[PDB]
Amino acid sequence: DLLVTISGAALSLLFFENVRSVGNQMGFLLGEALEFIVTVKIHINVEAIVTCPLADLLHDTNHINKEKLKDFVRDKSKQVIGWFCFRRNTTNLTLTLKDKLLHKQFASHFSGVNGCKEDFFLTCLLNASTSETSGTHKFRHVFLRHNKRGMFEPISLKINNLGDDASRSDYKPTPVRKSTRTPDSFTKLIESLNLDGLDSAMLIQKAAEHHLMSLIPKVCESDLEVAELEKQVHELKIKI
Amino acid sequence: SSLQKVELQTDVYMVCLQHALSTENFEVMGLLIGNFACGIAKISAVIILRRISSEQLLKAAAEAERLTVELNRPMRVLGWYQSQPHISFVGLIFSVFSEGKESKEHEIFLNCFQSDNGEATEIPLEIVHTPDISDRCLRTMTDLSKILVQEEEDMAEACKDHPDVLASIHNNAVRTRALIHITDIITKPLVQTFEKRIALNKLRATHLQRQLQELQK
């Protein structure tokens, strides 16, 4: 049994990046996979997303240049558990043959490194249509994986919120297996606190606030850094 | 040798009722222990079950033997009881937590029956007077607290040693509240009940002593 989980923050960032782009957009899903004993349950959590021009991954051919794909993702390959495809001006949530091809290629390439089976490599199909008077904006999406029987079956998505998350007894069971081999940014913060119940929960939240507040200028820096580099590359392309 | 009537002791009746009122969410269960004489099944003790199931019957049959030698009387598992909130063997069903929306009146039903091979019919029940609360019955309803605590400690055991700090804090928070919830609802009122029972007995005892003293004159 399979379940895809994602936070409001991560999901908002995905939709934020999609409505930004001039036209259609694709990229990769970063996250982990957890196993729970009950049969066994599989939770594939989506931590972050990253955009990528498909042309930068193609030879010349519609085949993914495996050399160019490694150079872009680099050391973040062990986190890629899926890819997404965004299309404007369509209410049609449809897998194209081209999309099926990209899924199979991306599955084979990442399955060895990400610590996950090729079975549950994710594909997220998003779209954005607008009304005649553009007074109503509709946003649709779905998660897919390639079945062992050759099927692209939809997976249940759970957006973890304050009312209901995927860890619902009120206890949080210890996962038997995790495909993550990357240090968590938040757990590193708690380790820095050098802790030795309620009082501990207060400090973590307070420390997270100061940490979160210090990240804000760093986020803005990296944003304008890429934004300028996005312009220079584009300016050169038009130049020629 | 044919079951004709069921006699339930009042102090055992109290234990079953107390167990039924422990929660209005789930159906609780237990095993009726006693003797079967001339068509009369007399229940003088009871065993609280942790929640048909087996193996527990073996622990009950062994306890029944421990009850035989102590009480100097034939003791065997005569059957079981179960609660029903918001709606060959002897069965008791304590229907509880049923109140009127406007009348503010609460109802409690107690049905007695004989069960065998999934079949059952009504059986005449009489609640027989007891001059006190049995030592075994006192210990029985104290075990309810111990069993509830034991259930919670088992659940937290499976989630113990969680790598994520936030999860460990969450689990210890859940265990803390749940233990407190048991103490406040089950353990503490039972403590108060016993204490008040003793004090109010001596109040009646001193009252009867004054009555007994002047009646002779």
Locate the domains of chain A by residue range.
1-168
Alpha-carbon dihedral angle through residues B132, B138, B141, B143, given to the nearest 10 degrees? -170
**Choosing among A160, A171, A190, which should be mutated to test the B contact, i.e. which has the most B CBs within 10 A?**
A171
| Inter-chain CB proximity A174 and B163 less than 8 Å | yes
Query: Residue B30, class by beta-carbon neighbours within 10 Å (0-12 exposed, 13-18 middle, 19+ buried)?
Result: buried
A197 Cβ contact list (under 8 Å, min separation 6)? B169, B172, B173, B176
Which residue, among A53, A63, A50, has the nearest Cα to A14 in the 3D structure? A50
For A173, which DSSP code?
P
B96 Cβ contact list (under 8 Å, min separation 6)? B17, B20, B21, B24, B83, B84, B85, B108
| Inter-chain CB proximity B171 and A200 less than 8 Å | no
Which residue, among A143, A149, A112, A140, has the nearest Cα to A42 in the 3D structure? A143
Alpha-carbon dihedral angle through residues A68, A143, A44, A187, given to the nearest 10 degrees? 70
HEC per residue, B139-204:
HHHHHHHHHHHHHHHHHHHCCCCCCCHHHHHHHHHHHHHHHHHHHHHHHHHHHHHHHHHHHHHHHH
Taking the CA of residue A75 and the nearest CA in chain B, the distance in Å comes to: 24
CATH no. for residue B12? 3.40.140.10
Bridge-based pairing state of the strands A2-7 and A40-51: parallel
Which of A172, A187, A204 is facing B162, going by the closest CB pair?
A172
**C-beta separation of A12 from A155 below 8 A:** no
d(CA B185, CA B178): 11
Q: Is some CB atom of chain B closer than 8 A to the CB atom of A205?
A: no
Q: Is some CB atom of chain A closer than 8 A to the CB atom of B158?
A: yes
Q: Which residues pair with B81 in a beta bridge?
A: B30, B92
A146 Cβ contact list (under 8 Å, min separation 6)? A103, A104, A107, A118, A119, A121, A123, A152
| Inter-chain CB proximity B167 and A195 less than 8 Å | no
Q: Spell out the long-range contacts of B90-94 with Cβ–Cβ below 8 A and sequence spacing 24 or more.
A: B90/B3, B90/B6, B90/B32, B90/B41, B90/B43, B90/B114, B90/B115, B90/B123, B91/B115, B91/B120, B92/B8, B92/B16, B92/B32, B92/B125, B94/B16, B94/B17, B94/B20
Buried b (16+ CB within 10 A) or exposed e, A148-173: eeeeeeebebbebeeeeebeeeebbb
d(CA A39, CA B126): 48
What is the extent of the structural domain holding B54? 5-128
Distance of CA B145 to the CA centre of its chain: 11
Q: Is some CB atom of chain B closer than 8 A to the CB atom of A204?
A: yes
Q: Is some CB atom of chain A closer than 8 A to the CB atom of B100?
A: no
Residue A42 to residues A115, A120, B125, B217: CA-CA distances in angstroms?
Answer: 13, 9, 53, 85
| Inter-chain CB proximity A172 and B163 less than 8 Å | no
